[PDB]
């Protein structure tokens, strides 16, 4: 009979990571192994951590806003103790890429990318950067844009947006914008950002054009700056996962007669490509491999397996470092269909996955 550890403590709790530590039993122990199991959600994925002599464990690759069981087993003489078990809910992740479109000198359209967690609403705060207290707006959980009105012209505003889920609040997404000078008419424009492009679109008009500059906010790449009267400018060749300052300036009769509009955005992470699944019927292990993501400075990859038949409890995931272009899954039922997905991971951010299905041949 192996005595169990004691006093489970939560050292770090973020949206994607939980660090736990515990007190050893008063007996000689080979090491500890940690299981992480979702409490309520069947679509979520668990993890099994290898044995270690450390009295703490850092668990990453968790889903924001999800409750997990954390179970610590002591190991001795090849036998395991009863688990030391505690529950923790991860925090919410913040909305990303607050974007602003100037419509008039008093109206601005706010846009953003919703967080990964399931939410019940947003709290949107907008106020003059250097004057007074900001207004607050209650925003619904399904929307990704909000119109602002009665703004002071030629004035800089500070904007914050937090996601809400019941009593839980995410960290804030922040941004700044400056309204147009009074009475100024700019053609209606729209912006979109992808992994490698920043695009501006508008309806062409005689003697009106746009200039779009893009440069990395942290430096490291040469700046870009091009113009067009065609109604669209596509700046491609950008690096995924990088913060870019992009500047828009209207051109009237080929001349710059209005102040430039300054914006900031982070390009989405790029997924891995060329996913391959190979199942060995004689050993029972599945090998997953991919071509590295084109995103530099990622933190790793997250690999999930899910049976396509809605089964529960057979949903494990693996987190690997960025030098790994492969991983293996051991106990998958042969003859059954599994969906395997691989995500590029950078801190609490993830790419869209690359996915494929496999039927392990039952020997």
In sequence order, the β-bridge partners of residue 89 are 67
Q: Do domains 12-90 and 273-358 have the same CATH topology?
A: yes
CA 277/CA 279 separation, integer angstroms? 7
* Burial (CB count <10 Å: 0-12, 13-18, 19+), residue 135: middle
- Within 8 A by CB and 6+ apart from 336, the residues are 307, 309, 311, 359, 360
At 109, is the secondary structure helix, strand, or coil?
A: strand
Would you say 61 and 38 are in contact if contact means Cβ atoms under 8 Å apart?
A: no
Q: Strands 145-148 and 84-89, how do they pair?
A: unpaired
Q: Which resolution, in Å, applies to this structure?
A: 1.8
CA 312 to chain centre: 25
Kindly report the backbone phi and psi dihedral angles of residue 121, in degrees, each rounded to the nearest multiple of 5, phi listed first. 170, -175
Judged on CB neighbours under 10 Å (0-12, 13-18, 19+), 343 is: buried
Residues in the chain, overall count: 363
For the chain, the straight-line distance linking the first and the last C-alpha, in angstroms and rounded, comes to 37
In sequence order, what are the beta bridge partners of 326?
289
Return all residues near 255 (Cβ < 8 A) that are at least 6 apart: none
- If DSSP codes are grouped into helix, strand and coil, which group holds residue 172? coil
Distance between CA 49 and CA 125 in Å, rounded?
41
Closest CA to 80 of 36, 38, 30: 30
Locate the DSSP E strands across 218-322: 224-228, 232-235, 243-252, 261-266, 273-279, 286-291, 300-307, 317-320
Exp. method? X-ray
Domain made up of 273-358: CATH architecture? Sandwich (2.60)
- Alpha carbon separation from 74 to 6, 46, 129, 233, 314 (Å, rounded): 10, 19, 54, 60, 24
Q: Which residue has the tokens 């489970």?
A: 8
| Rounded CA separation 284/338 (Å) | 14
> In terms of Cα–Cα distance, which of 221, 238, 245, 347 is closest to 294?
238
Question: Using CA atoms, how far apart are residues 31 and 54, in angstroms rounded to an integer?
Answer: 7
Which contiguous run of DSSP H or E holds residue 331? none
Regarding the domain with residue range 12-90, which homologous superfamily does it belong to in the CATH classification?
Answer: Immunoglobulins (2.60.40.10)
Looking at residue 119, the DSSP 8-state letter turns out to be: -
């Amino acid at each position: 009979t192996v005595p169990s550890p004691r006093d489970l403590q939560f050292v770090e709790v973020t949206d994607v990571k939980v660090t736990i530590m515990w007190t050893p039993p008063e007996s000689a122990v080979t090491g500890y192994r940690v299981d992480v199991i979702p409490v309520n959600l069947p679509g979520e994925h668990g993890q099994r951590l290898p044995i270690s002599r450390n009295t703490f464990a850092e668990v990453t690759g968790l889903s924001p806003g999800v409750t997990y069981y954390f179970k610590v087993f002591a190991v001795s003489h090849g036998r395991e103790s009863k688990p030391l078990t505690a529950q923790q809910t991860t925090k919410l992740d913040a909305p990303t890429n607050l974007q602003f479109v100037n419509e008039t000198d008093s109206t601005v359209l706010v846009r953003w990318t919703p967080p990964r967690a399931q939410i019940t609403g947003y709290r949107l705060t907008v106020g003059l950067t250097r004057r007074g207290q900001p207004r607050q707006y209650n925003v619904g959980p399904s929307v990704s844009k909000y119109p602002l009105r009665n703004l002071q012209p030629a004035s800089e505003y500070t904007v914050s947006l937090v996601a809400i889920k019941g009593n839980q609040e995410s960290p804030k997404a922040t941004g700044v914008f400056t309204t147009l000078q009074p009475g100024s008419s700019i053609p209606p424009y729209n912006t979109e950002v992808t992994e490698t492009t920043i695009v501006i679109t508008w309806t062409p008009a005689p003697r009106i054009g746009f200039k779009l500059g893009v440069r990395p906010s942290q430096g490291g790449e040469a700046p870009r700056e091009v113009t067009s009267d065609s109604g669209s400018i596509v700046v491609s060749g950008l690096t995924p996962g990088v913060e870019y300052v992009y500047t828009i300036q209207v051109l009237r009769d080929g001349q710059e007669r209005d102040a430039p509009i300054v914006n900031k955005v982070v390009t989405p992470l790029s997924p891995p490509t060329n996913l391959h699944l190979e199942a060995n019927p004689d050993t029972g292990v599945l090998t997953v491999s991919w071509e590295r993501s084109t995103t530099p400075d990622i933190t790793g990859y997250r690999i999930t397996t899910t049976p396509t038949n809605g089964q529960q409890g057979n949903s494990l995931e693996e987190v690997v470092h960025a030098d790994q272009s492969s991983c293996t899954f051991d106990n998958l039922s042969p003859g059954l269909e599994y969906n395997v997905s691989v995500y590029t991971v950078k801190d609490d951010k993830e790419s869209v996955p690359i996915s494929d299905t496999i039927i392990p041949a039952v020997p």
